[PDB]
Write a protein that binds this DNA or RNA. Structure first.
Ligand SMILES: [Zn+2]
Ligand SMILES: [Zn+2]
Length: 45
DNA sequence: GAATCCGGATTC
DNA sequence: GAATCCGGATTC
């Protein structure tokens, strides 16, 4: 089953997409803002 | 349908 | 082998 964000790390607590990282910039990506990506979810599923 | 986890293809 | 581009799939 797919994991949920931890909700507590600094990226999880950011309120908005940064608007300028690769994920916020690239027009075809479905990846979350790099500044928001949950630290826990960076571990391999 | 939006958000975005997740993993395949490319490219190095 | 792995970072990056990319988009299928789930969960709401
Ligand atoms: Zn961003
Ligand atoms: Zn988190």
């Amino acid at each position: 089953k797919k994991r949920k964000r931890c909700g507590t790390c600094d990226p999880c607590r950011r309120l908005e997409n940064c608007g300028s990282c690769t994920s916020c910039t690239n027009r075809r990506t479905h990846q979350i803002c790099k500044l928001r990506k949950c630290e826990v979810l960076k571990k391999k599923a």
